């Protein structure tokens, strides 16, 4: 609440549970690596 | 206008009586809304 | 066929599987900031 | 990661019958299925494989037409429906999952067949059952005349276990089927679902 940004983008989608491990900066798999991957530089957050 | 990438719009409307060129007197342009567009603009157009 | 896989593999999501394979909705907040002006910000604190 | 069968049994010539092979501990629709065929005391004779039901489903050359695989991603079953069985097709059944979607750091039996179930035991012969008889002789016991293979043969019902030594059973002229187990015999036939303690 006290840092103010351009833009917000709100990626949603629906993976597997012992997948969501995998949409966190630097994973590799088959989420991250094939179908969403986030770089390392990442700023943002993820809500599963 | 373009500041800071903040794009300005001052506006008045006035009731006049005229047919060509500007009326005289003076009516300053109040601030009407301000658009955080933050990109370069160079030209534009009208609508009719 | 071999070697033709169709890319996309479905997910089994069935009720009765483990939190493991529960479909689990995530949403990825990616925060941009650049020179175009900071347009989204948090809710300004406002004291009495 | 275990793939079970079941239906294997007693089959006259000709007839017809339905292998189901439950798969758990993995996500079943990600790799595809086969079936292999092992003659008693021969090698493994590849029998049908499969990825997708809308896909193609590829089968040996010996078995095109008589046989028919499936499969059930709700279920994680694997179906194989022989019929019109013929007299060579006597064998050992395995459901073996063959992998072939590698992931990146992931490296797993792509395109290996990775993982063999226990395999069920199909006999194509119209020759009927027949109860075990245990034949007593290093103690031993004999297990003579007993239809079809398998039988589980133990000493002191798995109790005595070291030096228990269990050779393979012969095809004699009447057809029946003799082991010997060398050091109680337990003797348990499922087929005839018979369990002798001498």
């Known amino acids: 609440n006290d840092l103010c940004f351009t833009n917000v983008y709100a990626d949603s989608f629906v993976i597997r549970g012992d997948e969501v491990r995998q949409i966190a900066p630097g994973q590799t798999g088959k989420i991250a690596d094939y179908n969403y991957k986030l770089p390392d530089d990442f700023t943002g957050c993820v809500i599963a | 206008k373009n500041i800071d990438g903040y794009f300005k719009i001052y506006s008045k409307h006035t009731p006049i009586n005229l047919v060509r060129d500007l009326p005289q007197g003076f009516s300053a342009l109040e601030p009407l809304v301000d658009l955080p567009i933050g990109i370069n603009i160079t030209r534009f157009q009208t609508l009719l | 066929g071999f070697n033709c896989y169709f890319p996309l593999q479905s997910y089994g999501f069935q009720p009765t599987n483990g939190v493991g394979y529960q479909p689990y909705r995530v949403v990825v907040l990616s925060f941009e900031l650049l020179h175009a002006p900071a347009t989204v910000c948090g809710p300004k604190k406002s004291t009495n | 990661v275990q793939l079970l069968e079941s239906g294997g049994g007693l089959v006259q010539p000709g007839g017809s019958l339905r292998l189901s092979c439950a798969a758990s501990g993995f996500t079943f629709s990600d790799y595809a299925m086969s079936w292999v065929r092992q003659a008693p005391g021969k090698g493994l004779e590849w029998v049908s494989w499969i990825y997708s039901g809308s896909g193609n489903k590829y089968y040996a050359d010996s078995v095109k037409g008589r046989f028919t695989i499936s499969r059930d991603n709700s279920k994680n079953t694997l179906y194989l429906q022989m019929n019109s069985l013929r007299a060579e097709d006597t064998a050992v059944y395995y459901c073996?999952?063959?992998?072939?979607?590698?992931?990146?750091?992931?490296?797993?039996?792509?395109?290996?067949?990775?993982?063999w179930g226990q395999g069920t035991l199909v006999t194509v012969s119209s020759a009927s059952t027949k109860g075990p008889s245990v034949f007593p002789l290093a103690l031993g016991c004999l297990v003579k005349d007993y239809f079809p293979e398998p039988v589980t043969v133990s000493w002191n019902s798995g109790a005595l276990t070291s030096g228990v030594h269990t050779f393979p059973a012969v095809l004699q002229s009447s057809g029946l089927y003799s082991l010997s187990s060398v050091v109680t015999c337990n003797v348990d036939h499922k087929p005839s679902n018979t369990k002798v303690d001498k």
């Open positions: 073996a999952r063959f992998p072939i979607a590698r992931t990146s750091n992931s490296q797993s039996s792509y395109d290996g067949m990775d993982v």
